[PDB]
Amino acid sequence: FSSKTEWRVRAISAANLHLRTNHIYVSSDDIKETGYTYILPKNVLKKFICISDLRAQIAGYLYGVSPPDNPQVKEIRCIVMVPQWGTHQTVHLPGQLPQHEYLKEMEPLGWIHTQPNESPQLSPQDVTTHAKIMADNPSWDGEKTIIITCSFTPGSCTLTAYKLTPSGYEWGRQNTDKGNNPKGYLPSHYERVQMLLSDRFLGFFMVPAQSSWNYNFMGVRHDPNMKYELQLANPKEFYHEVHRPSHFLNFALLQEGEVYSADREDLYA
């Protein structure tokens, strides 16, 4: 990434990121119908779309539960965003989990990230990243945990959803080569899960206590296992001033620079 001019062309696109969210289309396709069916509150998709970036892979953990007396629907009432650094087509996060007061009564539903570009199938990196999250944390169960990828389509935002199959868990648990076409990647690993929008409920977002979610500026300030607290507050926009320090703290200017043009009108207050 150019970090200087592809920086700002991407940011001035990122100035418009809120026109995106009100044009949606969903993957309408074959449902096996005995797997869970996931409920999306349009608000968290509003915030997700707005704070993201047009290249950098940004992701979050989903939190929510099943309603009383009818488990087969899993309503997601929480989107957590984690410290990170993402690629343009894969997002890398710390292994260690969110846990917090409001995080008590929910389980992790899986995770959801963005995508500049489109293809009607799951990344081998997606299946394997999730299978390796599930390699460590059995809190993630096979028939429970999903991946939702949000392609930025021309005049629309599209969200394709998958769950892992046990054979996909197998290949991902195995995976060493994370390349764009690893040997042994095929349809045989992923399966698309039922998702739908619903205007009935407003949930909440989550953000680290001592950080914000976007370290994409700070790939050295990120770690494999580095731990974090949580709190209830808004994520900062991907290109926020706060995680934008060295461009704004690039300061080499002197006091004498005011000694010139020393007319000192205020005329006010």
């Binding site: 200087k4 809120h18 704070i51 300030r221 209830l232 060295s246 207050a269």
Partner: protein, 1525 residues
């Protein structure tokens, strides 16, 4: 007549203050014109002081006032002008207009005019002390502000009254500006503070408005000066109170015009003295260059410089003025090149080598800046830039007689009085960033730098050189003379001024807009010279009034403000409507053209690049462009920022964005045009961001307002969010902060280490503890909050905001400001916001804010509330609210629909012998009675009734009472209400309705045991209150006369859901089980308001449902015309300040010819509100329209009073109410307000309860009140709002009844929602347990946990806690959850009862009452207070212990504390009998023991405290007897 639109752009005179509207100038005495080679000189002789008149003697500071002789240190005898003006300047409030030239000390004339106000406030053993008066000295320059601040502080300190610069933020420097006396500021600055609302308290404490450099009316910002002048004059006249205008203006014409403008008496009040009063006779060479040639002009001007310094190179001091910073030292060293290419001929300004302090010249050689290269020689400069004390050491160097030649900038002339033997303004050309281009320098600077060409001491005959343009040459002679009128600049400004006048309320209609013009200097200018002001003598003579010109002008500004939508003003009537965009424009002094443009562009999720974009869209710098040569570094600025400007090309907006982002990252620029451009855009960025974010937060864009607040924070703190807030502590090292950020040691985990491991981060362990000091001083807060739902559309959430850091008045100051925001699902939909501030006293202390938040019909996970410092950037804390386990309440089904019932006449009940007192008042029944008769009168079962206050449940319960009386003659009805005085209202009505007619004894019992024992059961109808029927009948089983009562009326039932409810509800359930025991039920009349859960009341009462006729407040005998008026002014000070006039407006608009109930938040304040209403209806010049009868017949009510305000207020017919007022005064006030001669009652907050006299329009003002426990304000109850509103009742004649309430912006939503919507009542007996537990346990009804739970099984909690489980703290919906809750309930109640050792808990099964709880319950005392007794009192105590313990009971612990009451109790216990140790006067117990001792010795107190004292004795004797027990 109908309005005609205008074109007012070309009707301005651009280049204001350099216009020189006078086309021909007049030469002075010895003046002539000298012709040189392409450049002309005007040789002007100097003026001579006036010839000495006989007995014309100056004053000494001794033969002026003997008192004001203080602060006069350093003066011997008064200067001629001050001595000629002082007598009139001090002896009376006669306003002043001074006409003179610089060099007299007009400051010294204003100082005498201010010693007048000084001597206006005095005492003997008490001082000038500033708790009396405030004044304001205004001048248009902040350099002069700092000067006069230093001077006024030192000089007026000797009186002890502090003067300061009015430079603080409105709320940051309001508490500390209340402690200061007369202040100093600028015209526009004071205007901003007043239009914002900072002056809303200082006004009417203001006596003297002094205006220095008053000739500035001809200036650019003149619209602020003249609009403020108009404000002063008009509001002073509108109030009939005066304010003095003491102005000092340069010698010029238009003195009488400005004298009529200042309303000062030119007769004996004005003055005249031309330039001959200037100290140093000013001989002027006004030489212009006449050529255009620019590269040759940059030589010709330098040549004039060369010759002028050749003229000064002898014995003299040459002080040059230029319009930049680096020119000070660039024209210098060019004089070095001049005297050095003169072959050191003309140099050496001394007599010789060791002459003229060459040793000091060389000895002070090394300096701060590049001054050194010259200072070894005789040339020097001045500016603020070089260093901090550099300009100091240059000015004092010149004053030490060694600096023969100095070149400098306009600030160095504006500053301290550093005079010159001769001064020269060079070029007179400035580059204006406000004009974007070349401007002739201002005229105030001209006079300022021209008073320093020649001195009072150091120079005799001033030589004043002006090298200038030979176009503006003759104007420069008219300026050297007093030929120019002081013209006003209204035309360009007009629209914003008019919008702001309406936005504050000074123009209600275009009528008042013409009234705004009729008092301005503009209309006065044209009243002198419309021929000059663009209105010919033909039209001006066919229309004398100039109300035609006012209709033309004002209407065009109105139409423009309409076209920009910052006004809403209908052409028909003349009146206007204001908006939040217009309010932001007014409050930040912004224009509504670019304001509306920004409003149109800024969308919801428009990025931060979009925010800086619509910021570059600020057309205040519409003359921003691209610099041709500087376009190279413009791209460099386009390269060094992270948020790219690339959206555009090199252009005006690109300049805006890139200069702004550079100077936000604190970038310097080589080019001076670009430097000033960035300076200007960033200095207007304050107003831009403030107004933008203001309209954003007023709208409700959550993440958008967050982004804009971040941009405003970056503008304020000159740094971005990814750069540490650590840069806001400036005594802290940049390298330290940078090493803390190198390895980002997070702003979260920094106090996770101690100052060992804190310094372990960047290994600087001599700085780690200072770092921790900076961290802990950065205000940082935690908070805890509880959310409990009311209904599926309401959940009330109380937040206590605590600080987790410490504050210091050198870091946080006198206050801390942080905004908290309650926001929905995606931090885009904003629910509600609070701007919370930690006071000076309240630092580190918990601050509680509660809010009922929306979630109607919702199944969503949570919400947020972020609390971030306004001032401090990157300083925040989040408040989550997660709804995983949040469930809904049961939604209420629709109410029993009001059927169609033909009006019932009093012939319904056939007992005319009973209707004898009914047929006389009303002919027809209301819908409530017409529906509920068939359930109440012809029926004998229990009944529940919901109807709004003001409908008539009186006849509903009377039907049942008359029925039971007809059943049995002496058969008894126990009527009980939650209010004692309202039950006494029931007494004074029902006793006269029944006993005089029905012969049956109807009475109202009292607290007295034996009195009630004899009275009750003897009469037919018995009126009681909550405790009245709790304490008694807690003895139920042996209580025979209460047991033989026929029926029970619970009137005002839904009081249970409020405070003091559980007492009455406990009486209800207890008497219910008693009626179950009595084998004859006692019909239960539940009469209350519109209830959501009326079904629960019906279940608690056991009445049939097809008879339980519940209605909504929408079925009320008279409907309510409902109006709500928000408040975006947080501080109740300015809120109540501007709550006056709109109250009158809504009065006259709703019902001008009707009675007015003005509910004011204070017994103290209703007089204030009715009086301000009288003084503003004096503006509505029709006086005493609220009086409908004659002055003389009202007198016998005036002969029976003392209070002096009521005389005037009621003779005008408004009047107010209070507690200490006479009883006959209250009766006669009700008499006048009822007879309607005084068709207004202004009434205290506490009065509407027992008030049987209704009004026509009810208006509630300040729906909160102040309690000293939180030392703060709290909002009103829902039943209280309904009561103060519904106390407008006019059913006999009027077709409506009106309720209007002015609430805060915070409470607007819940207030509007629960005004007409249905209100519930829920359980509080689970909150207050030990009372009934101990009492019934002693009374042998609560003898085991089983019987306790059985009483819990017929309670009100039984229904409520299961119906609405969020407030029940149990997340369970089933009978097993009811089991867990009930077990917890009885266990913990009898647990604490046996814990305080008050009762016996046997074998863990049985519960019986023992001595402690026995005496407690007997005396009707708190069990906590009884344990305080048992474990404080001992055998050793005398009355010294008795008084402390007796006041330390909870029996008085609801007692109040009033406004600044902590001085009262402390300065009373100063000399009262018994003191305390480190006590609080904000303490209930200390206050109560203090009042007890005070009254025991019988010292003289106020009735406000004697009411408290008598109430304390009402519950003192019982506590004292139980204490002996």
């Amino acid at each position: 007549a109908p309005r005609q639109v205008l074109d007012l752009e070309d009707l301005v005179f651009t280049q204001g203050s350099h216009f020189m509207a006078n086309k021909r100038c007049q030469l002075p005495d010895g003046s002539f014109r000298r012709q040189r080679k392409g450049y002309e000189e005007v040789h002007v002789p100097a003026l001579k002081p006036k010839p000495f008149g006989s007995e014309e003697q100056l004053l000494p500071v001794e033969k002026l006032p003997k008192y004001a002789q203080a602060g006069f240190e350093g003066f011997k005898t008064l200067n001629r002008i001050q001595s000629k003006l002082y007598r009139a300047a001090l002896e009376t409030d006669e306003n002043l207009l001074l006409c003179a030239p610089t060099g007299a000390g007009k400051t010294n004339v204003a100082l005498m005019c201010m010693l007048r106000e000084i001597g206006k406030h005095i005492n003997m053993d008490g001082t000038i002390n500033v708790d009396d008066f405030k004044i304001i000295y205004i001048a248009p320059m902040r350099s002069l502000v700092q000067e006069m601040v230093g001077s006024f502080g030192k000089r007026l300190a000797t009186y002890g009254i502090t003067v300061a610069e009015l430079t603080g933020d409105h709320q940051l420097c309001k508490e500390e500006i209340s402690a200061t006396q007369i202040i100093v500021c600028t015209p526009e600055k004071w205007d901003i503070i007043t239009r914002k609302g900072g002056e809303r308290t200082y006004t009417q404490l203001v006596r003297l408005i002094i205006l220095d450099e008053i000739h500035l009316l001809h200036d650019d910002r003149g619209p602020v000066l003249e609009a403020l002048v108009a404000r002063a004059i008009r509001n002073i006249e509108m109030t009939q109170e005066d304010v003095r205008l003491i102005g000092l203006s340069a010698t010029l014409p238009n003195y009488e015009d400005v004298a009529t403008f200042l309303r000062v008496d030119p007769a004996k009040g004005l003055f005249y003295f031309d330039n001959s009063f200037r100290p140093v006779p000013l001989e002027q060479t006004y030489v212009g260059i006449t050529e255009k040639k620019a590269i040759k002009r940059f030589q010709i001007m330098n040549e004039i410089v060369y010759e002028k310094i050749m003229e000064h190179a002898g014995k003299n001091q040459v002080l040059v003025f230029v319009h930049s910073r680096k020119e000070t030292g660039k024209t210098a060293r060019a004089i070095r090149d001049m005297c050095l290419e003169k072959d050191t001929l003309g140099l050496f300004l001394r007599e010789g080598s060791a002459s003229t302090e060459v040793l000091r010249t060389e000895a002070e050689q090394c300096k701060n800046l590049e001054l050194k290269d010259l200072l070894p020689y005789g040339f020097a400069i001045h500016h603020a830039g070089m260093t901090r004390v550099d300009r100091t050491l240059v000015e004092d160097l010149f004053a030490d007689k060694h600096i023969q030649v100095l070149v400098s900038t306009a600030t160095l002339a504006w500053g301290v009085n550093l005079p010159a033997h001769t001064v020269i303004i060079k070029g007179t050309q400035v580059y204006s960033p406000e004009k974007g281009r070349w401007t002739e320098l201002g005229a105030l600077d001209i006079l300022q730098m021209l008073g320093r060409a020649g001195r009072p001491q150091y120079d005799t005959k001033g030589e004043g050189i002006l090298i200038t343009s030979h176009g503006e040459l003759q104007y420069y002679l008219s300026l050297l003379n007093q030929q120019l009128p002081i013209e006003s600049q209204m035309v360009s400004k007009l629209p914003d001024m008019l919008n702001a006048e309406i936005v504050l309320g000074n123009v209600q209609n275009a009528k008042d807009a013409v009234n705004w013009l009729g008092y301005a200097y503009l209309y006065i200018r044209m009243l002198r010279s419309p021929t000059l002001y663009g209105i010919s003598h033909d039209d001006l003579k066919g229309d004398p009034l100039l109300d035609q010109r006012r209709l033309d002008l004002v209407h065009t500004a109105a139409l423009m403000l309409d076209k920009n939508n910052l006004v809403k003003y209908d052409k028909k009537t003349g009146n206007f409507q204001v908006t939040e965009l217009g309010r932001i424009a007014s409050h930040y002094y912004i224009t509504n053209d670019t304001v509306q443009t920004y409003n149109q562009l800024l969308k919801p999720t428009l990025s931060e690049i979009e925010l800086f974009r619509v910021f570059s869209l600020s057309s205040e710098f519409k003359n921003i462009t691209v610099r041709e040569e500087e376009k190279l570094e413009l791209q460099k600025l386009l390269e060094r920022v992270p948020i790219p400007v690339k959206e555009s090309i090199e252009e005006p907006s690109a300049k805006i964005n890139v200069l702004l982002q550079a100077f936000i990252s604190q970038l310097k620029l080589e080019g001076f045009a670009l430097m000033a451009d960035m300076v200007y855009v960033t200095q207007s960025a304050g107003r831009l961001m403030r107004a933008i974010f203001e309209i954003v937060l007023n709208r409700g864009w959550a993440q958008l307002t967050d982004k804009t607040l971040n941009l405003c924070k970056m503008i304020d703190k000159r740094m971005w969010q990814s750069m540490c807030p650590l840069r806001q502590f400036r005594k802290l090292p940049e390298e330290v902060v940078k090493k803390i950020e190198k390895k980002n040691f997070p702003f979260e985990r920094l106090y996770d280490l101690n100052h060992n491991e804190i310094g372990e981060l960047i290994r600087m362990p001599k700085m780690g503890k200072t770092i921790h000091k900076y961290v802990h001083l950065f205000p940082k807060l935690e908070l805890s909050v509880h959310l409990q739902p009311i209904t599926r559309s309401t959940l009330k959430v109380e937040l206590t905001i605590t600080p987790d850091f410490q504050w210091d008045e050198k870091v946080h100051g006198s206050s801390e400001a942080f905004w908290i925001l309650v926001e929905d699902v995606d931090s885009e939909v904003i629910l509600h916001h609070e701007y919370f501030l930690l006071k000076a006293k309240y630092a580190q202390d918990e601050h509680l804010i509660t809010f009922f938040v929306p979630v109607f019909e919702p199944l969503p996970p949570q919400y947020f509330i972020r609390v971030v410092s306004d001032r401090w950037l990157s300083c925040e804390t989040q408040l989550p609210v997660s709804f995983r386990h949040l469930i809904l309440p049961e939604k209420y089904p629709p109410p029993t629909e009001l059927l169609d019932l033909q009006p019932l006449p009093v012939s319904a009940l056939r007992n005319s012998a009973f209707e004898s007192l009914y047929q006389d008042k009303f002919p027809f029944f209301n819908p409530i009675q017409t529906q509920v008769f068939n359930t109440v009168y012809n029926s004998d079962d229990n009944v529940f009734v919901g109807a709004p206050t003001g409908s008539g449940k009186t006849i509903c319960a009377e039907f049942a009472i008359l029925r039971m009386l007809l059943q049995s003659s002496e058969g008894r009805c126990v009527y009980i209400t939650p209010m004692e005085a309202l039950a006494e209202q029931v007494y004074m009505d029902w006793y006269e309705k029944f006993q005089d007619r029905l012969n049956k004894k109807v009475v109202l019992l009292t607290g007295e045991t034996s009195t009630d024992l004899k009275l009750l059961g003897k009469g037919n109808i018995i009126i009681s209150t909550p405790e009245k029927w709790d304490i008694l009948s807690r003895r139920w089983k042996q209580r025979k006369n209460v047991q033989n009562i026929n029926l029970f009326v619970v009137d005002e039932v839904h009081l249970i859901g409020g405070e003091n409810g559980p007492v009455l509800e406990v009486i209800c359930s207890r008497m219910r089980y008693i009626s179950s025991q009595i084998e004859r039920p006692i019909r239960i009349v539940a009469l209350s308001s519109s209830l959501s859960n009326a079904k629960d009341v019906a279940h608690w009462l056991g009445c049939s449902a097809t008879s339980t006729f519940n209605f909504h407040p929408n079925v009320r005998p008279v409907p309510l015309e409902l109006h709500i008026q928000g408040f975006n002014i947080s501080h109740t000070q300015t809120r109540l300040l501007s709550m006056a006039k709109p109250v009158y407006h809504a009065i006259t608009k709703h019902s001008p010819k009707k009675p007015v109930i003005v509910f004011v938040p204070s017994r103290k304040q209703t007089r204030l509100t009715a009086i301000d209403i009288l003084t503003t209806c004096a503006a509505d010049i029709q006086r005493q329209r609220f009086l409908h009868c004659t002055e003389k017949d009202l007198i016998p009510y005036l002969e029976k009073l003392s209070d002096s305000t009521l005389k005037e207020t009621l003779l005008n017919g408004v009047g107010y109410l209070h507690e200490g007022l006479s009883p006959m005064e209250r009766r006669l006030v009700e008499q006048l307000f009822s007879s309607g001669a005084i068709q207004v009652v202004v009434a205290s907050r506490s009065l509407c309860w027992g008030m049987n006299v209704a009004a026509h329009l009810v208006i509630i003002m300040d729906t909160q009140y102040y309690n000293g426990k939180i030392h703060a304000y709290v909002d009103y109850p829902i039943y209280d709002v309904l009561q103060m509103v519904g106390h407008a009742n006019r059913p006999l004649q009027d077709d409506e009844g009106r309720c209007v309430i002015m609430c805060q912006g915070s409470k607007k939503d819940f207030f509007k929602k629960f005004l007409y919507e249905p209100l519930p009542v829920e359980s509080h007996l689970d909150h207050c347990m030990h009372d009934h537990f101990n009492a019934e346990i002693v009374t042998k009804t609560i003898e085991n946990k089983q019987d306790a739970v059985d009483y819990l099984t017929w309670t009100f909690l039984y229904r409520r806690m299961t119906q609405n489980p969020n407030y029940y703290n149990l997340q369970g919906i089933s009978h097993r959850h009811l089991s867990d809750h009930l077990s917890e309930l009885v266990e913990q109640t009898l647990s604490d009862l046996e814990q305080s050792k008050c009762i016996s808990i046997e074998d863990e099964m049985d519960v019986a009452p023992l001595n402690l709880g026995m005496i407690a319950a007997y005396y009707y005392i708190n069990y906590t207070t009884i344990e305080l007794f048992s474990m404080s009192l001992n055998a050793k105590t005398k009355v010294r212990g008795l008084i402390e313990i007796i006041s330390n009971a909870a029996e008085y612990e609801n007692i109040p504390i009033r406004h600044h009451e902590d001085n009262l109790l402390r300065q009373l216990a100063q000399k009262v009998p018994h003191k305390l140790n480190n006590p609080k006067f904000n303490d209930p117990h200390v206050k109560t023991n203090l009042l007890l001792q005070a009254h025991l010795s019988r010292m003289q107190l106020s009735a406000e405290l004697q009411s408290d004292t008598e109430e304390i004795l009402s519950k003192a004797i019982r506590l004292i007897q139980a204490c002996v027990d």
